[PDB]
Amino acid sequence: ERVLKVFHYFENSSEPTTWASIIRHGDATDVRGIIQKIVDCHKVKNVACYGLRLSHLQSEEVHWLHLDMGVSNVREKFELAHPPEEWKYELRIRYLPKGFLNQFTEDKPTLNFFYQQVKNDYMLEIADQVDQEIALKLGCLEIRRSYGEMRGNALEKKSNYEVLEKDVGLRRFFPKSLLDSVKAKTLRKLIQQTFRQFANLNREESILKFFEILSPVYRFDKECFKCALGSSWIISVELAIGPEEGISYLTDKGANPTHLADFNQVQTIQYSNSEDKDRKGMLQLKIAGAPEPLTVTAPSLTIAENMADLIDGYCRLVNGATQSFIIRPDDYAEIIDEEDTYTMPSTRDYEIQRERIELGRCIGEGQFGDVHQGIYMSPENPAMAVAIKTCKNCTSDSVREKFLQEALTMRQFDHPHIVKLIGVITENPVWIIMELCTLGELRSFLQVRKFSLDLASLILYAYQLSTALAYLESKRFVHRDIAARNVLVSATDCVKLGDFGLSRYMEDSTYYKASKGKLPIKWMAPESINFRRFTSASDVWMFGVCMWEILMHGVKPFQGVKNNDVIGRIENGERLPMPPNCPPTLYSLMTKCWAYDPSRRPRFTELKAQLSTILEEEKLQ
Amino acid sequence: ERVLKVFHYFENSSEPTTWASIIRHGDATDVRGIIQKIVDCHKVKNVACYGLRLSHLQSEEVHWLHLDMGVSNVREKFELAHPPEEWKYELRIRYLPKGFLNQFTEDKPTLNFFYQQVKNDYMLEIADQVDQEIALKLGCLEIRRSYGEMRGNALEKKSNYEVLEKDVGLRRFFPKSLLDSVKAKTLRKLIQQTFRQFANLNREESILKFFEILSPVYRFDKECFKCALGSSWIISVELAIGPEEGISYLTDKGANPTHLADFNQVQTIQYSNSEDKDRKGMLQLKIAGAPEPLTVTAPSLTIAENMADLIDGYCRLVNGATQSFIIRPDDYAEIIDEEDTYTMPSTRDYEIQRERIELGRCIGEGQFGDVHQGIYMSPENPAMAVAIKTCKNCTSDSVREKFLQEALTMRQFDHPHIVKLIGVITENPVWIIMELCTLGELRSFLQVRKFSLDLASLILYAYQLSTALAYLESKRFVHRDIAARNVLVSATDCVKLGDFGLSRYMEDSTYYKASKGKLPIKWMAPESINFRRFTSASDVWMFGVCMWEILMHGVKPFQGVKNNDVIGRIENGERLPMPPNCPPTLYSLMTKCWAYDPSRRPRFTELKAQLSTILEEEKLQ
Numbered sequence A, B: 001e002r003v004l005k006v007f008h009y010f011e012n013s014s015e016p017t018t019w020a021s022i023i024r025h026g027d028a029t030d031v032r033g034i035i036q037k038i039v040d041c042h043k044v045k046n047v048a049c050y051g052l053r054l055s056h057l058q059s060e061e062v063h064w065l066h067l068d069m070g071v072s073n074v075r076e077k078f079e080l081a082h083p084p085e086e087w088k089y090e091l092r093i094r095y096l097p098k099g100f101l102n103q104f105t106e107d108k109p110t111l112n113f114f115y116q117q118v119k120n121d122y123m124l125e126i127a128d129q130v131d132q133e134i135a136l137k138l139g140c141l142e143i144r145r146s147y148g149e150m151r152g153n154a155l156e157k158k159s160n161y162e163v164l165e166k167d168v169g170l171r172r173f174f175p176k177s178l179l180d181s182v183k184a185k186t187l188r189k190l191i192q193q194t195f196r197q198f199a200n201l202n203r204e205e206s207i208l209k210f211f212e213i214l215s216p217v218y219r220f221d222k223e224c225f226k227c228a229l230g231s232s233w234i235i236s237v238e239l240a241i242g243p244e245e246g247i248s249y250l251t252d253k254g255a256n257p258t259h260l261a262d263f264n265q266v267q268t269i270q271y272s273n274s275e276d277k278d279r280k281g282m283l284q285l286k287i288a289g290a291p292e293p294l295t296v297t298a299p300s301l302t303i304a305e306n307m308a309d310l311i312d313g314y315c316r317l318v319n320g321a322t323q324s325f326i327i328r329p330d331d332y333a334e335i336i337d338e339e340d341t342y343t344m345p346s347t348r349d350y351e352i353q354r355e356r357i358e359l360g361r362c363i364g365e366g367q368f369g370d371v372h373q374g375i376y377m378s379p380e381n382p383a384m385a386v387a388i389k390t391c392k393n394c395t396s397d398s399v400r401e402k403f404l405q406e407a408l409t410m411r412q413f414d415h416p417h418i419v420k421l422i423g424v425i426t427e428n429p430v431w432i433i434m435e436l437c438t439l440g441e442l443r444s445f446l447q448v449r450k451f452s453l454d455l456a457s458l459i460l461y462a463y464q465l466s467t468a469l470a471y472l473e474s475k476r477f478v479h480r481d482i483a484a485r486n487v488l489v490s491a492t493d494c495v496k497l498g499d500f501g502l503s504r505y506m507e508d509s510t511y512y513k514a515s516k517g518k519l520p521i522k523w524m525a526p527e528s529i530n531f532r533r534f535t536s537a538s539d540v541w542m543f544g545v546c547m548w549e550i551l552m553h554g555v556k557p558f559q560g561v562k563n564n565d566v567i568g569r570i571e572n573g574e575r576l577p578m579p580p581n582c583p584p585t586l587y588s589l590m591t592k593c594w595a596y597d598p599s600r601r602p603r604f605t606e607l608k609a610q611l612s613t614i615l616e617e618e619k620l621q
């Protein structure tokens, strides 16, 4: 079963780039018939025009993908490489005839496709960057386009513009450097006066206006490349290939490019590697009636092959060709509507959208603010029960950066018992993705659920923590404050370690330092109390404090004790008494972790192996 | 990839029969090595003792499954039959030696297995049936067993028994006919005085006490069958096969059975069909030194083959055999912990558990009470965002039965746009499973989201309703009150029909009748206003009322009109004006549904085909 998801820019109802191709295809399926189907699903003229492209979520180098290069062969060639959920496929225009605005004015759906496309690259690269008035123009053009039938006096009104700026929220297409820079009534009046003049245009006309104003700030007709040109004295330039010029290239970054020939004169194409270990590609260009090749060498065979496709497809387009002028050295598909959407992988997007959220209420309180419960919406397995934490004060950037540091650290984990953060927010009050622990804190449940606990339950609590902090040691961070207050319950047979505010990555080199905060002493380990030395030693220690308190029914540690007397009685090697009904080897391992030799307190991985054995003995006997 | 889920009675921490085998096996895997692994996972003696069984969720006839009958061959033999999520596999004891209590007292984990097992069948069949004192005894024995280490003065206390009766809730193992029959302080004192005498026992002893008291109310040692015996004058009796007798059988339902021989005298076994078209099975029984067979014929070859396994396995058990005395006419497995739990199907359980729920708050108000938002927890894709509706008054059984009738009707649907109810509750305030529509009612969103709507959006609203009510007509119910108030929004590109309080199944024969309620006239269709005739006619009518109001931006129907004047102006054939910005063929189909000929108002299936075409034209142009 071969299924492919192909993003595109054919307008859909809900959010603007969730335009997702469910394509079922065969083993021999070419890109030709796939996209043929995709466009026949939208009654379009332009046929040899859309460039199919590759995309790796966690990278930036891509492949403008050939057609007869087999679909399954791509799937081979780049799942031999990396897992698919980071891979991704993208379809785009790459080609434009002479008056492309006109020969796509005849084809309105492709005009919208190119619109969405060009604007895509815009909002990627230059959205929060190019100036105020530029983006205001482009944004109110975006208004009048997306609104095919809105009035002209629509946004003249007080409350009804409050509608847009609040309920919609203009993060969709108005960018940051404006929107988080202006007063309320100010920005009201500002975009009023902007929108006053664009009251009337339709899809076609609004869109051609967009191009009219968008041409200078970026040459969307082309895509600028850098390379080096020459036969055997060679020089490293910028490069430009587009319909406005055919093929020309520069003498200054600011030069009017020096034309020499168009795509129309092309005979054939070839790409090949730079002839050394550099990750680079040659590019030679034989042309009609030319004894001469326009030789180029640029940072990649990747883009070399892609540029070969560039010339090949303008040849196809603005001649009568539809064939491969690239000199190299049965099958049916069907666009799936919904069915079961089998089968997407996991997500990794950091930026968060604010529409698909349930607003929650009090679940927990953190150092930076209240905690919340909500659900996120996506493709398969949607409306996921999820949670968020927010900061009460946004006047200090410092706590903002720590609040960020949470997620920016907590990204990279991977285990069945480390909690599922996904995303990042970037405005006040910045909030968080939380895999909600439905059960909540284990101090309160243990306190009020005395008759709802079992010997196996406490052991498996410790077992989950075992594998958890084992994985920490496999990937080197010192949590510094492990506690049931910071321990969450997912379900009756499943706990999870949280609270990574104090967690640090050791360069494996010895200790961590100290900053500020009244961390509880009774829980803390002696060497660290004395010298700010948090390592595997105190890890095993407070791990044992945790195992203890779990098995205590979680009564407060060192009951009726003073933090100064604590370390003195530790210097008297005093450890806390066994519980009632405590089994032997479990307590034995607790004592092993109670070794006043911090170096010889045993590790969690070994304790987990021991906990695994103690758990079986308990369930057995 | 072959994976199997096998329920069992080996105690786990959380709810008592969610004890789920994740078994990965091979193409040749016998039941022998599978269960060998399952028990080696629990360090058990008893080896040739557990009977593997089949189970069909929506039926009651099963198969006590043979061992060397291939696992994949079962999967064949009964997925050629029906879909798997209704199929199910079950493992049990079927065999007991002479002093089975003793030869399982040597094997405590199997003692618990048999405990859970026998109690399973108990709570299936006779839980809410056998008398007060019987179940009180059994229930406080259940207490002292599940509590391996609780005190004896534990439930002597006021608040701490309030703990059990509230937070636990005794639906787990105390049954209905008591629990919903007694006053608060009464039942407190009652089960106090019950529990006073069982203060001390352990697993082993509590469990043997359970058997001591449980033997008379049911002969768990055996399972009673009915059949007919004789060579060529034949007679239809009840039958009993167990270890307490070996093999004996009755002359009265109340007779002391007349023993003739044990399992020990058995030579060989055979089962075969009743020799006619009856769905029945023969059962012949050749015995040691016997010229005679103990011939039986009973309602099924199913149970004939199973009883062949009965005798075969007591032979195995209480002789030195481990071989198949049934006369018929490489492979490795590994118990999976969690991994990804691939791959379970859909659920259909009606009875609801009250532990895995989030308590919600006001989402909507129904005729019977407030509506709520919560999440359910299960195996794969758990913590699902779900919803419930409750009734304010529980003093009227009538509204209870209608509130039940909701679900008991709404069970059988199947479509991507009919809403996902699952379960049934059976005590005040009875609540409901709801696939939450996160967006909510479409009247309010349309009213306050005037600038957030698109032409495609309204068309696809109508399209979803198209396929929905098309499926109604394919399965024959008249909703009677279709409306956006009753229309829900799942997501921006997805609406769902709800409100099945008025919905009725036509025997296809003409009309439905009328009861009571101030249903809105403006929405209703003329013939039904006049004669209580709700059929495809009024279906198409109010379907058009719905399409209209959707396209209206949902302003109230017949603005400033009196319900009496309504039908008069209908008799003047008056229909409501086109909207602003209304497209042609969409309005045309609205008018087609506006035909004062109710017989010739076109159906939804044809409208859906037309809506599908109008939607494409809009997205195209």
Ligand SMILES: Nc1ncnc2c1ncn2[C@@H]1O[C@H](COP(=O)(O)OP(=O)(O)NP(=O)(O)O)[C@@H](O)[C@H]1O
Pocket (backbone or CB within 6 Å): A363, A364, A365, A366, A367, A368, A371, A387, A389, A419, A434, A435, A436, A437, A438, A440, A441, A485, A486, A488, A498, A499, A500, A501
């Ligand atoms: N994923 C979650 N699921 C459920 N509740 C959560 C979750 N995350 C945080 N909470 C709640 O918020 C409380 C504080 O979380 P925590 O991560 O310990 O915040 P903190 O700012 O580091 N507080 P502190 O323990 O003093 O360092 C927890 O005790 C929970 O009640």
Ligand SMILES: Nc1ncnc2c1ncn2[C@@H]1O[C@H](COP(=O)(O)OP(=O)(O)NP(=O)(O)O)[C@@H](O)[C@H]1O
Pocket (backbone or CB within 6 Å): B363, B364, B365, B366, B367, B368, B371, B387, B389, B419, B434, B435, B436, B437, B438, B440, B441, B485, B486, B488, B498, B499, B500, B501
């Ligand atoms: N599945 C659901 N998801 C979200 N909200 C719901 C859901 N079911 C019901 N509601 C809410 O409860 C309200 C009443 O639901 P409904 O099924 O129409 O009840 P009713 O008793 O039949 N009321 P009525 O329309 O007068 O016949 C709806 O308008 C919603 O606000």
Ligand SMILES: [Mg+2]
Pocket (backbone or CB within 6 Å): A481, A499, A500, A501, A502
């Ligand atoms: Mg913290």
Ligand SMILES: [Mg+2]
Pocket (backbone or CB within 6 Å): B481, B499, B500, B501, B502
């Ligand atoms: Mg109703």
